[PDB]
DNA sequence: ATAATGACGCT
DNA sequence: AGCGTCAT
């Protein structure tokens, strides 16, 4: 209608690392450079948790959450980099740095949303609004673009795969009207020849390659960003939304991945996002509340509203180890010595906290978990975080916890404790 | 025995 | 507060 906003009022993009850890351990050690690698943290159990796999070893069939030991029966000439290991546990610092290399580089740009180690969403909006009056109104040239997909194209009245990005590409911009300075298809293509130059900047001072995706808000960008790796990006425009939702299943769909997902699917009996657009607003609502109702009815017509919030660090700082099977916690002594391997990570970077990025944390969170309960937590206190200390940080969650123990001795622990967490929060200024 | 973390919703 | 959900 006339008086219908169609969640094109930004220009946001996600970028996305390519094989975050091992593109880090083969910028490192070149003997690990275009070969089929993955990156294992611990080995005794297997062979090690394979955590990150090059394309290479892909093509193998490597995955991530497969044991080491499988990995080379897909893949004999496998090559393997391990995490580093600190006081008894895996340590990611060098990928934690790496990442925040990338996060400055990004910076720059524009304002970000970090969203995990290696993704950070980006609000584009006002950087193209100036790139628009900077560029006088003279046609986007092709060659501004040479790493993007256009998601629907080409289409109508052809065998090689840089043919037909180009071919989209080509169909795409001869349809553009530079004419209107606030034209939505206009703004995301100048979003992406802005992520085009993010991203050459990024492999230009880190060597690290990624993909990104460019549309009007963060599930579409996200969902781009997917289309087409690695080391391209995708532009996934407000009008190619109705044919990409229609055989898009839902569960691919950022938030709707998990039990959500699955009953929007059971109690509609439907299998993809589009089909969600034959519903009201009323009628998703009752069946997934007001505020599930509300988004879902915007989100399948391609319209979402959550904002990148501008902040590019965290606001947690915690640190965890599982401990599988026959590992698990049954005595005092382990439980305190694991408490306190744990606080003395979490006091470092803490200590890092407070001089890099001027602040400390005021809460402590423990979280265990114990055999045979399959949730992430079973339990989750909290006490006072006054001092930077390991072993004070260390008895004190040991205090927040001892009553769980059930043992009639209590030299020993149980049910025994399959999960450690320690956790900073409520952060200050300092 | 697919980890180690982080953010946010509900009550 | 403390637990449940979703994510990389
Ligand atoms: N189950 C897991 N266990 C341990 N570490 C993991 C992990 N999943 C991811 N990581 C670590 C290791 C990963 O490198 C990093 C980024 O996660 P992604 O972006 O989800 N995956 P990647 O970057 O590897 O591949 P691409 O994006 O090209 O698909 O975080
Ligand atoms: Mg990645
Ligand atoms: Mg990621």
């Not at 037909?164 to 939505?184: A, C, E, H, V, Y």
């Not at 996200?222 to 939702?245: D, E």
């Not at 402590?364 to 045979?372: C, E, H, M, P």
Request: proline share 4%; with cysteine.
């Amino acid at each position: 209608g006339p008086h219908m906003a169609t969640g094109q009022d930004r220009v946001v993009a996600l970028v996305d690392m390519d094989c975050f850890f091992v593109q880090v351990e083969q910028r490192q050690n070149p003997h690990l450079r275009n070969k089929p690698c993955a990156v294992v943290q611990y080995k005794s159990w297997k062979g090690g948790g394979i955590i990150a796999v090059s394309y290479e070893a892909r093509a193998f069939g490597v995955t991530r959450s497969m044991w080491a030991d499988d990995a080379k029966k897909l893949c004999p000439d496998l090559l393997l980099a391990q995490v580093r290991e600190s006081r008894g546990k895996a340590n990611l610092t060098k990928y934690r740095e790496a990442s925040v290399e990338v996060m400055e580089i990004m910076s720059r740009f524009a304002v970000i949303e970090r969203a995990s180690i290696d993704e950070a969403y980006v609000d584009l909006t006002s950087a193209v609004q100036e790139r628009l009056q900077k560029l006088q109104g003279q046609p986007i040239s092709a060659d501004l673009l040479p790493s993007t997909y256009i998601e629907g194209l080409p289409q109508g009245p052809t065998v090689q795969k840089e043919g037909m990005r180009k071919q989209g590409l080509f169909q795409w911009l001869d349809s553009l009207q530079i004419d209107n300075l606030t034209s939505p298809d206009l703004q995301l293509t100048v979003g992406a020849v802005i992520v085009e130059e993010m991203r050459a900047a990024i492999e230009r001072e880190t060597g690290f390659q990624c993909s990104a995706g460019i549309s009007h808000n963060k599930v579409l960008a996200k969902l781009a960003c997917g289309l087409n790796k690695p080391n391209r990006q995708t532009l996934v425009s407000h009008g190619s939304v109705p044919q990409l939702f229609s055989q898009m299943p839902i569960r691919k769909i950022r938030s709707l991945g998990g039990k959500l997902g699955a009953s929007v699917i059971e109690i509609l009996g439907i299998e993809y996002m589009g089909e969600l657009t034959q519903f009201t607003e009323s009628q998703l609502q009752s069946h997934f509340g007001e505020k599930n109702g509300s988004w879902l009815y915007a989100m399948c017509r391609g319209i979402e509203h959550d904002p990148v919030k501008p902040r590019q660090l965290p606001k947690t700082i915690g640190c965890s180890k599982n401990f599988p099977g026959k590992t698990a916690l049954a005595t005092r002594e382990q439980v305190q010595w694991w408490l306190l391997q744990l606080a003395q990570e979490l006091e470092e970077r803490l200590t890092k906290d407070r001089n890099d990025n001027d602040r400390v944390a005021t809460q402590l969170v423990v979280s265990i978990r114990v055999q045979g309960d399959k949730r992430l937590s079973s339990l989750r206190r909290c006490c006072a975080l006054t001092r930077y200390d390991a072993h004070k940080m260390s008895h004190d969650a040991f205090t927040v916890i001892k009553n769980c123990n059930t043992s009639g001795i209590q030299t020993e622990w149980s049910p025994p404790l399959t999960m450690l967490f320690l956790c900073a929060t409520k952060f200050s200024a300092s």
